[PDB]
Design an enzyme around this catalytic site. Sequence first.
Site, short mmCIF file in Angstrom:
data_model
loop_
_atom_site.label_atom_id
_atom_site.label_comp_id
_atom_site.label_asym_id
_atom_site.label_seq_id
_atom_site.Cartn_x
_atom_site.Cartn_y
_atom_site.Cartn_z
N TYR A 160 0.81 -1.25 0.00
CA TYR A 160 0.00 0.00 0.00
C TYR A 160 0.83 1.28 0.00
O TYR A 160 0.28 2.31 -0.30
CB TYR A 160 -1.13 -0.10 1.03
CG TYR A 160 -2.30 -0.90 0.53
CD1 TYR A 160 -2.99 -0.50 -0.60
CD2 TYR A 160 -2.70 -2.05 1.17
CE1 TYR A 160 -4.06 -1.23 -1.09
CE2 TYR A 160 -3.78 -2.79 0.70
CZ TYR A 160 -4.45 -2.37 -0.44
OH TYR A 160 -5.50 -3.08 -0.92
N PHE A 204 -11.61 -2.65 9.49
CA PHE A 204 -12.57 -2.55 8.36
C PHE A 204 -11.80 -2.98 7.11
O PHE A 204 -12.38 -3.25 6.07
CB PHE A 204 -13.16 -1.14 8.29
CG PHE A 204 -12.16 -0.05 8.05
CD1 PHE A 204 -11.78 0.30 6.76
CD2 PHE A 204 -11.57 0.62 9.11
CE1 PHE A 204 -10.84 1.29 6.54
CE2 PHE A 204 -10.64 1.62 8.89
CZ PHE A 204 -10.27 1.96 7.60
#
EC number: 2.3.1.-
Lengths: 394, 394, 394, 394
Positions: free
Chosen positions: D120, D394
């Site tokens: 990422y 999440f």
Amino acid sequence: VTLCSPTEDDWPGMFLLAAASFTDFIGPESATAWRTLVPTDGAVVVRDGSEVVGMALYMDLRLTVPGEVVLPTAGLSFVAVAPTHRRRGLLRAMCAELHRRIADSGYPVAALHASEGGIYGRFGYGPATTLHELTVDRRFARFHADAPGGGGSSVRLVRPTEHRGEFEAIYERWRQQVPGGLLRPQVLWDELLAEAKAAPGGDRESFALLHPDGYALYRVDRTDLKLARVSELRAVTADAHCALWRALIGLDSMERISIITHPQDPLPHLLTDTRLARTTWRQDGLWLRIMNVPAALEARGYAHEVGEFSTVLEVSDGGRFALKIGDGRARCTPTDAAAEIEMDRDVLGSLYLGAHRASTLAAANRLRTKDSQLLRRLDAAFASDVPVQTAFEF
Amino acid sequence: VTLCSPTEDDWPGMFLLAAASFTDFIGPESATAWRTLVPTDGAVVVRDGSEVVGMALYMDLRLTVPGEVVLPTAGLSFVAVAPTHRRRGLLRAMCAELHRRIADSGYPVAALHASEGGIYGRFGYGPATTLHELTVDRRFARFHADAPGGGGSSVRLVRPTEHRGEFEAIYERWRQQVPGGLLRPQVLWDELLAEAKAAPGGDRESFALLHPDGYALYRVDRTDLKLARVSELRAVTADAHCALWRALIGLDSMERISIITHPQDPLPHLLTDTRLARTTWRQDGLWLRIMNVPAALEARGYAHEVGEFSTVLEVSDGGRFALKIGDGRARCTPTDAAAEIEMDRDVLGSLYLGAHRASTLAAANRLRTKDSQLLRRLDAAFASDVPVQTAFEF
Amino acid sequence: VTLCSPTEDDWPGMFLLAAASFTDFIGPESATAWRTLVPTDGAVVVRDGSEVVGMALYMDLRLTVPGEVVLPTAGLSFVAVAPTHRRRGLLRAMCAELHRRIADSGYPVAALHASEGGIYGRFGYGPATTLHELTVDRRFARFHADAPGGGGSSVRLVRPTEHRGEFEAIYERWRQQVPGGLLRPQVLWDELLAEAKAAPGGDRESFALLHPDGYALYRVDRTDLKLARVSELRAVTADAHCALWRALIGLDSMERISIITHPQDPLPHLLTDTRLARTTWRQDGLWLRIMNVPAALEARGYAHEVGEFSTVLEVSDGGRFALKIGDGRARCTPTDAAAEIEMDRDVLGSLYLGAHRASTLAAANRLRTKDSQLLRRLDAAFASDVPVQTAFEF
Amino acid sequence: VTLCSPTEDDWPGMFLLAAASFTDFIGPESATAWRTLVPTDGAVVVRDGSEVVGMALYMDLRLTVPGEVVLPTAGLSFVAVAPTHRRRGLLRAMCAELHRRIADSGYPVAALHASEGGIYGRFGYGPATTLHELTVDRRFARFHADAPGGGGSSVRLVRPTEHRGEFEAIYERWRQQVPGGLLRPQVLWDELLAEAKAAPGGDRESFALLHPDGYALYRVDRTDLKLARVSELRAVTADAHCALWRALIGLDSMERISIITHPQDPLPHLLTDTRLARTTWRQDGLWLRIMNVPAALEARGYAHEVGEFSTVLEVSDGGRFALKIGDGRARCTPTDAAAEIEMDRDVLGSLYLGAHRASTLAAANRLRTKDSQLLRRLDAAFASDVPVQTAFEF
Ligand SMILES: CCN(CC)CCSc1nnc2c3cc(F)ccc3n(C)c2n1
Ligand SMILES: CCN(CC)CCSc1nnc2c3cc(F)ccc3n(C)c2n1
Ligand SMILES: CCN(CC)CCSc1nnc2c3cc(F)ccc3n(C)c2n1
Ligand SMILES: CCN(CC)CCSc1nnc2c3cc(F)ccc3n(C)c2n1
């Protein structure tokens, strides 16, 4: 912080504390079955301000002691302090109230299984029976030429649920005959056969080996599919005991059979190689608190090979007694004569079923006397002819 | 394939077979020390065509049996068959020749430590002493209020090598007083203090705890530096035994103390939590073969609490005897009267030091009788007042 | 039970207690080297009746604190109570005598490494530096585009012993510049290069990676031959730190590189995948006891980004002080004014090198104040610009 | 290979890819709940020829940043490429389209939890919060004399499901006050209490400890019945935090309590032995991508202890800004002046919540500047008064 008997409204709070305190807790329907064994005023709860933060109860039990004598026994269980109320003396307070009630009801002894071994000696409980785990490597297991049942087998492989009546009758005979024996009521047989079913993502189906004079309940382990766990083996004769072990060693798909049994289990001597039955694990079983010293000592049988002798036993904060033991019977009377043998109440609990030698407790100074001869006499007198065993966890 | 006594030229070949057969073999200088304990004609070798492919010997030992009686004992050891000569009956042949020589020399008993548990029962050896490994989690270990020595400590931390004389004297007192006790000669004390040194990439330095009436030898484990292994603990009084354990629990850098001891070790009862002394491991120690049944049975003391009784013992292929036991003494005479108790010779070895109950061997049908009363009487008579222990491996 | 300074005859007894107490103890020649760092009257022994059953000493050390300030430091070490003399207050007595001597000699601080974390807080020691073990899976390790040194390498693979002088000079620069830095004398460099040799059946040969401004000492693990242990990595510039890690990740035969470093080690940020440098282990390093609060607080530098502020610090049983902090300097004067910040002496030790935030100790109520603003100001003031590190175990 | 917004018919295909891609996937009803948090046009799918082989979405979240400021946040989640379509640039394409939509919608920041740590950073995400697993050996755990709540306990043991409202209110207060805080909507509270039930052959029943200003959710581990896992502990005051830990240490049946917490958790300082709270595990938590540098930098509070300073920050391919920081506020304006500090966008994400020191990223050359003074100023300015924490995955 009040201490009282639970009303019907307190039990949901007790089941919550149970779920939080006990990893073996099953649920309310199971707990409600066990509850049938608790007498009126057999339970105490501590409420705060009102949620339950403390509980203890005893069940009405029948304990076989040496001489095949059955004693009414207060079975202590379901003891829990909320983790929010530790070090607040809720245990000491609850145990004190139950012991008052147990003593006043006329129970000569109380018993428990200890979750930990360092908390019950101070309340007068001594470890009274020893559990041994035996693990057999059954791939090397050959029975000795001398081993019984070596025609056709008298052992049948059966569904536990279809032969309840035969197991009940065999156990009933076993428990009346063995020190540590406990009467198992209907609701505990309902629980035993419930825990014998396969649980989805839990334990595997249990099978029974049924002999006219013995049974074994066994299941394959959840994770290790080469290990068979014998949950229960009850044999009334040596023929039954050996026959059930021929069958268990006959489980050819398994590498290992494991069982929780007693130090005097004869299984190792049934094999050409005693060592193949390894002791993997060893722990205290039933703990005994003697509630009434004279009633308990007078109620059990003693070795008939010990010649009549007399002594004075002082139990710390539990009385001093003239103890006369002769032809397997004891008389125990108040005296103020000088004590010859001193011991805490818990040490007496440990001696009571013949699992611990007085010589051993003496060597640790748990049991004081300036007479070697009296020590040997207590050892022989208190020894049990039938080896002491553990019935079931409560 | 000849069987004979080794000449001086055979020993290098025997040391080769030793190195190949025994993982605990140290070397020729060590083996030559042990060799001083082998009498003239105490060794047999099997030669092929001439390399040694078989060996067995006995050492001259002194075994303490119940009643503090010391028996000359043939200690069987250094038994090996070359892996190239298995299943050729070299063991049966060698054992037969040594038993002939042992019997004819006037040894009442022979003893061994078994590398495996399924090969010595057929030669008349029964397991006679039990080893227990105790592992204490010493971080939770608190001594009981009743435990002795609870001023200043009488225990000293010392270099083993500088206090040889004190250890010898303590052990000499211990061995004369305890069933399973063996005289330890000079060369076995040389070996014990040699194995107490730190070996480069081997074991760590050993330390001693020295009391006037006891010592413990201990070392930190090679790999697990939070475990202390007690190699030897010899206590003559309960004061010495408890004091040495206060010191060992005082090793604050260790998480665990492990020791090989006996089932009646009082250590668990010295603690507020008996459970902290866990039994990790359990095995047969010394094996006994009774060479002469009447000589052995007559030589040991019996429980003085057992009332005079008479019976007929048949040992399979070992004679039938009128056995009269009274006031801790036995008379054992040839008879042709009907046997009341039957057992193989190995079962007698197992009973001889009081480690196994006759009731237990009976329950496995290793010991036959149609009289429960006689069984209880044998149990009580053969029981040992002082608990049976294991001296050292040979 | 006398407490005094050891004479030359006491040291053999101290080395015995050392061998028994410390698993990392090497031997007398090694101990005699460390002994050169103990000043006259830096050692106490407790004798019994006369063998040594207690010892403690301090070494003369130079500790770098924030602001690149070097403090004379009493380094507590070689602390042992014989296992035969536990719970006899020998530690409390020995620590009290050394603290008297340390205080009276003019050491502003004392330091130690704790064998256990629950015994030194009561003597005024707080954990002052944090060790992190990083384990890199070097098979996935790619350096970031931004990472320095990504021509030819400036890092050389060398025998540690042949480049002692280069390591000494690099370390000397490192220690003067870093909080937690300790001067390493000649005898500790003799020990470091001794422990760098392969030991027969011990550790493997150690290799060095040498940069003009950094070195790493590393060895392959004894048992896991795919793991390289970095025993020491000292970098003076970011170029040196990254270059040494390019070399270590270049050990293509290894799966894992492990190092004991500090929480602010930039290594994770040198890689495209920060997660490949896993924190396996985390522990207190150096413990500090502030001997003189005003001398210590006045000697270190403070953050120059914190605006001048004043407060009153009470150290429990250690004095109350008007504390004025301004442009990275502190003045600390006796006052009887109402305290605004209270803390035990150990809490001050924990704050002193900037490893622990005052906010964190406040949240645990180890540090009391009714002013959030003052808390933020202490946090910022006591923070260290250069991250705090651990020099070497003593 | 088309990239577009999913229609209602695409979701069954997305749930299939979810089941195949995510081991924590529960099912369609659970996924349909999470789906309520995805805005219109918050999802992209890649179809082939038409089955879904690619998906990515963001949820509408509210992230608390330092200064108790709540930012609308694009929460990236449900990102998967079919294993049949790897190395086809479907991720780069999907992330590019979501970032376009996120930027154009006016989200100042986007956040994610990374399944892996090396994928990422290239999309502008930097690790912004740190998870620490603490494991307490609660058998040795004693609270410090200074620890709060040491009358009667204010903590209650409760069924999670019966006190939802109290947990919601406590969490709502917690999240508004703590950097890393996330608003938890109704459907995520439905999921939390669903995962708190015992699953047949899954997790055990969860219990709650409820204080007016804190709660802990805990369960016993599936396999290790001596380990309690704290799934969530939310405390608003230090009193609540310490009280909940007194209760957890009060779980006397457990050997170990494990929790995922933050590096500044004060628990270790509540105990006499800081070391008993071991750090077992350490990992990146929330990852931040700054979508709008001026909007993000201007929205958060800064340390009020840092004196007003000005600099020029260049974010690579993300703009150059005149950065003025004064009395905890920042102004950030376009400039073409020479940059004094350079860094990739991901490095800014890592600094934004105060979890990483600028000095540390500088030492790895992730953050370039030729001014030590400016580095110290950024460090102090960007530091967070309240320690940064992770809300929920999440
Ligand atoms: C000790 C053996 N366990 C099986 C592994 C027991 C099953 S769990 C359980 N539940 N309620 C009760 C209970 C309720 C009462 F009112 C009284 C006693 C009880 N016991 C032992 C209980 N045990
Ligand atoms: C049984 C305890 N072991 C220590 C671990 C023994 C050390 S190795 C060894 N070597 N030679 C001999 C030996 C030589 C002989 F001639 C007779 C007996 C011997 N034993 C037991 C030996 N044991
Ligand atoms: C702490 C790091 N260890 C290496 C693993 C140390 C090596 S063992 C050892 N021996 N004597 C001493 C010694 C003797 C003294 F007189 C004073 C201090 C000492 N230390 C730390 C010692 N350490
Ligand atoms: C990350 C924490 N896990 C619990 C261990 C999540 C439970 S599994 C699951 N299912 N659907 C979704 C989902 C569906 C959407 F449309 C959007 C986001 C979703 N997330 C995170 C989901 N997570």
